[PDB]
Subunit: 208 residues, 5 copies
């Protein structure tokens, strides 16, 4: 006998947008997977690439779960009412442009899902973009302030073609995508920051 | 009898901008109709266009109804005070730029109307743009987080000149526009999201 | 005797920035006139132009009035503290960049004056810009959501210098400016929306014989 | 004997940012002085300059005064918690861009000092910019809505080096900067609006 | 004992973001160090550069400390909840483009750390950029409204590779980075303003 309104209110009433949902005291496991949608502006001279991708972000806050037996099992919730991982693109050279409604999806089991479409410039290896082997641009995305003990990242290795959602009208094509997990520490501080290194192998389509 | 100040006050009193106005347990009937007003920047090599259209969006929210017997049966309300469908252009390469005041129109029966002027850039086939056959750019629009069970999108099929309000000073011209109802799915979830496929057909206005 | 501090306070109470001050059942009369200040990037190929102009907007909101007997009859108030017409440029291709402070002038008789300096890009006939007759760019401005029964727009046309405030350093010169009242009923709905057509006639300077 | 916290706490308890601090009924003596920091862009053909400057602005608001005989007599406050003069550049062709933190300095005696660094484009005389005598670009800054009786603008004309803080790396050089006062009346209304006409005599750098 | 929610809750219970936390009556010690990431745009004619760096900002705020005996001694906190130094690059010709989540790291002892990746444009010496000895662009950063007796800025001599995080895909390379502590007094007031001067010696790459 619970409607979507009741569900939302319960989330607001128990969620803390500025507090990380640390269960017991292990880190919060965040899953991050990108699905390239397009590759626009490209410069082999400056090694800069403009790209659009759907950043599928998933985690969980069990303090928000309800009984979906006779109630909706999911609801969209403004991300501002929810705690969202402070993910950041380490080699980005421009703020991310969120092209889609900043709405998240909360599941009755406490699972939270946020998958916005983002356009952002990157500084990566662009050389070879016009060769057969193409170029390989690596994008590192992970928490900015939360280290491993508090946040952990892992690619969603679920099956899905590299360019499953890639634009056909794009001047380029995706050869292969490989989302690996990686760590990043600094000469100052001990704790390491987990990230996902996404390698996008793409090249310029040549007319026959 | 109550006036505008009362109605508006009451609307703001009962509007839940973050909760989908699901009457009973059926999707919200959102009708979408794009009205191309101009076609600016256009590139055939990168398949990219900059368009200005009026996104006529329509839906109902019974919770906002009231007796208009002896009072205004229509008022302008800030879309921030209302729940608004979370639409997105699945093939947009730039966030939508609302060029007009973000005001919606509310009718006593609960029929909400919002139609803003939006300039945006999409990724689409532009080939032939400089021919008599012209180019056909297809733009899909639908909810981003709400599937068919939560939201339905049907093109407000209004038989009208596809260029009824299209600038005459544009370097291009419309041959014909068609808006079909549609949907998409992904490799993660069974739920399908309804959209609208506005197929634009235009070519550069030859200089004769 | 009340001061400006009070006048403002009392105004923030009776003011409803989201409620159009209709008089009984009389549409709100809003006067709109542009005072062109400059003409920048003029692309005769895309029929696009960047214009800077002061938009003098007037209207009355009795619910704002007060006793100017022993108090100032005029004060400057933030536009968010009161209702403001949802004017728009129907043929604008860029958002209206407001260059000046967004404050309006309020008179104890409820008369409201708002005159912002705006930088904006429109789509219009730019052809002929480099000819003796020049080009004639028409800008259509009106309420976006309030139709004729709610908002009535009329240009405060009066024998004035069309280029009175136009920049002398501009690459262009104003041949003539005319503001006409118009109306548009969309083939969807009955209500007719009022607007003002400002036809700007201008050309490049330093032309040949 | 109060402290920073008290001084601020009290400011918001008395400050009215929307109310001009008119003592009795004499206008607010606001002083404006520009300190040109750079000249980034200049168009000889279209008569437009893009410049950077520090806008030293001073006025008084005794309703914010406090006894600093046993506490600081100066504190930095966000201009958002204070009333501020509604100055504008009558010949500005782009909205002002404040590069520095929007903070003012309030002295225990009610004196207020706000000096932001600004990047802005103006329409002015560029002719002669490439000659030994240089060009003269006048910039008129005054209140946008408060006529002479409410606001008065007077430049603090003293002995200061015109290009004292001017960047040595700019492509131009300051020849002289005279800051005169002026009154601007309108063919609409009787009262005039006091303004300050800053004359920036500069030329392009080009020695032997 | 307490959770992260308790920590933050209390932080916002005693934090005065608009008040400088001057321990006793002495200036706040703000440590500032730049960690260069990239050198994008460069114009030797206009003497302007586009730089991306991590501004490692550090200071202490005793009004936020708490017991971490059986609780965490660190949390990520939105900077909107803390007081933050009003730092500003003097020769910056564009406002800072914060590319990362605006979160600060606070320790149980009141230590605060904020390291935002920033993309910004400066007016400095670009001459020789294309020579072997490269160019030396000096960047000056310090408080904007707080003088030496309120805020003191000093570069953490944390020796390390100057191009430790510098992108290897940049068109340029770092030859040397030196960060000296300096001071500046303006012909307005006797109070001096501390700042750090970061000299970045770089050049365009190439092949031997
Ligand atoms: N996979 C998947 N789902 C996708 S890809 C592009 C849009 N969607 C639908 C969606 C699903 C969930 C959320 Cl939080 N946001 C968007
Ligand atoms: N069709 C239609 N209506 C149009 S086209 C240009 C202006 N209008 C009026 C209008 C009517 C309703 C709303 Cl929510 N927004 C705008
Ligand atoms: N005419 C006129 N008035 C002008 S033109 C440029 C500045 N002014 C003063 C003014 C007066 C009132 C308002 Cl709301 N805005 C500006
Ligand atoms: N003169 C002076 N003061 C200057 S020039 C550049 C920075 N400063 C310090 C300052 C002092 C006070 C305020 Cl409100 N703003 C800036
Ligand atoms: N040194 C260091 N730390 C770095 S360099 C790039 C990211 N980090 C982690 C970090 C740590 C703390 C804060 Cl407030 N912000 C960022």
């Amino acid at each position: 006998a619970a409607d979507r309104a009741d569900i939302l209110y319960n989330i607001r009433q128990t969620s803390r947008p500025d507090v990380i949902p640390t269960q017991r005291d292990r880190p919060v496991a965040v899953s991050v997977s990108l699905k390239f949608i397009n590759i626009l502006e490209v410069n082999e001279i400056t090694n800069e690439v403009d790209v659009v991708f759907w950043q599928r972000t998933t985690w969980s806050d069990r303090t928000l779960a309800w009984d979906s037996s006779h109630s909706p099992d999911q609801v969209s919730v403004p991300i501002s009412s929810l705690w969202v991982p402070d993910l950041a693109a380490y080699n980005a050279i421009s703020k991310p442009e969120v092209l889609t409604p900043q709405l998240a999806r909360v599941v009755s089991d406490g699972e939270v899902l946020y998958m916005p479409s983002i356009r952002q410039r990157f500084s990566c290896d662009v050389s070879g973009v016009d060769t057969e082997s193409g170029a390989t641009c690596r994008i590192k995305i992970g928490s900015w302030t939360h280290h491993s003990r508090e946040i952990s990242v892992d690619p969603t290795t679920e099956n899905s073609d590299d360019s499953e959602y890639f634009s056909q009208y794009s001047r380029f094509e995706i050869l292969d995508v490989t989302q690996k997990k990686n760590s990043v520490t600094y000469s100052c501080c001990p704790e390491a920051y987990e990230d996902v290194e996404v390698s996008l192998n793409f090249r310029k389509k040549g007319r026959s």
